[model samples]
Target: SMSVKKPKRDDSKDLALCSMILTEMETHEDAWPFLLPVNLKLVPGYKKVIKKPMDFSTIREKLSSGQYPNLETFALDVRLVFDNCETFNEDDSDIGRAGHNMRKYFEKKWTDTFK
Candidate 1:
């Protein structure tokens, strides 16, 4: 159910590749560069999100204490992936490969945490 004062997922500013893909398909829109399923599935299974049983406030506190080196490292690596999305692609298929790699990185990071 939706609330009168809120929306489930905001379409603007918070859209992910998957959302845009579905929207484009719905409207019979032409595909944008580097925005195909081939790239999306390079690191397959990003569409699935496992719910966490832990409290986020506790996690936030732990991060604030600077005792989470793994988290920091992981964040840096993720940024690198985004920053180099184009760097990894040397050909037409390179874009797809990069997408897969990026998705796989996040999948590996949250796989254990989510499960």
Candidate 2:
């Protein structure tokens, strides 16, 4: 039997830009790029399914292009690219909003570090 080794999904080291956004959501909700963190994660974690690294890189390039107006726009773009097959905000709540709420829950510490 052949065994396949699953790659490690280290949110910290894996998605540095995402980690930065999560931290922003936690520390500064108004300044947050997206609406929520949990929702953001949901879009990628559940709603979307793109090949890693490459998918993330493309998003980064677009983000750097200054095309996004705000967190909502960024989240929408992310959802469209990553989770086109899934619906967003299916779970209603702060941590489910996909911007500030989700960041407040999952990356609170990362956000606090900003202050």
Candidate 3:
């Protein structure tokens, strides 16, 4: 019932890997701050701190649409989420704590699957 194009799911196995990693990220309890774009109005100074804000859902949409031609590009965007978190979120901040856990999870999953 939507107008969005749902790209093929199996042409490149890397896409499947991206999807699986993202699914678990979306499922993570600490993923709340990362599920969607950070609200600029809700978080003061966010825009100034994070010039390029990335999130799981945006990555999901990009992956679902096959925007990434290579696995490397996909992985870069995935890391961007954590990088932005580290920059914008201070120690003990909600985003910081979650990003640490999520980053570790992504690293392990990444190595287990592709490293």
Candidate 4:
């Protein structure tokens, strides 16, 4: 059996950025709703999926738990929470716009930290 390991990188800044983002999610009213419970019925075989309520506190625990191997992986976890929500990526809706804005905000954080 073979195991894969994440390539090493300096995560001091990235982790702090993630913390900042998580704090924003916790304190801000408009941003926190992105973690609302998704409609499981929208998909077939939804029973197989864990229908857990995804909110700021849940996500904050996940990110802070030291489960993810790196910043990129942690960022992906954060994005997946939003992507699963209804109309998250759509440009026409307010939720979608908020999602888009959050993505851009994170992107800038990454760039600023990396560069």
Candidate 5:
């Protein structure tokens, strides 16, 4: 019922958050399925891991137990899943956009903590 103006999101913080979340996602032995945007599930390379979704329960447990030093240090280890993911071309399929959106969702949650 009340309107609230959302603050401008910081690109660095968003990226830092994204990287930290993705870093957590990467620890699993078969994190590829969880990493891939759902739209890409049927793609050739990803088909094998479709049934192998990574369990994130441990990440929650670790976080609660203080596994990470801090978000900033954790973010420094963030690595892009698909090396060619940054090569955005209009002619290419929307996979890149899908992946970006998925990461953005995680970033938003991270920024929410500061509010």
Candidate 6:
């Protein structure tokens, strides 16, 4: 076996930006539902509807623990949070509207941060 150079870059700054975005998202007005996992008690069939439920707390923990290989990977999970939201709620519903807004907010932040 031979050792190979890792593709990792000086991504500390990127991770810092990710942290900032996460914090902002956590405090967003429409972020209430996404801060933590869904309460199955209140909403039945959620487990079956959203097989891969993703939330802010989970993303924060994963990011801090270095589970994401890069900003792109981190963004994927963040997007997942919104995707799951859309899956469970109607586009005209409060939760669905929030999800749309949050996705727009996060995506804009992502572009602004990287650009």
Candidate 2: Cα lDDT at 90? 44
Error of 1 at 56 (Å): 28
Q: What is residue 113's positional error in candidate 3, in angstroms?
A: 0.5
Where does model 3 exceed 4 Å of error? 1-11
CA lDDT, candidate 2, residue 85: 22
lDDT of 6 at 56: 99
What digit string (tens of lDDT, one per residue) describes model 1 on residues 65-100?
Answer: 654454444344334433444444443575545545
Over 12-87, each residue of candidate 5 has an lDDT whose tens digit, in order, gives 4543454465564555444443443445445554435434322234334444565657665333223233223433
Clashing pairs in 6: none
lDDT against the true structure, each candidate: 0.38, 0.43, 0.87, 0.62, 0.44, 0.91
**TM-score between candidate 3 and the true structure:** 0.85
Q: How do these models rank on TM-score, best leading?
A: 6, 3, 4, 5, 2, 1
TM-score, cand. 2: 0.29
Tens digit of per-residue lDDT, candidate 2, span 2-96: 58767854434324455466344335543233332334454555435333222234556656676555444555554543243223334454433
Whichever of 2 and 3 has more TM-score, that candidate is 3
Candidate 4 residue-pair clash tally: 0
Give all TM-scores, in the order shown: 0.25, 0.29, 0.85, 0.60, 0.34, 0.87
Model 4 C-alpha lDDT per residue in residues 1-115, reported as the tens digit of each score: 2587678666577667777867765555557555555556774543355343355566677678876667777667666655554433456777677776776666676577566
Alpha-carbon RMSD to native, per candidate: 16.7, 15.7, 8.4, 5.5, 13.0, 2.9
lDDT over C-alpha atoms for residue 111 of model 4? 71
> Which candidate leads in lDDT?
6
Model 6, CA-based lDDT: 0.91
Positional deviation of residue 62's Cα in model 1 after best superposition, in angstroms: 21
The best candidate in terms of TM-score: 6
Q: Which prediction has more favorable TM-score, 5 or 6? A: 6
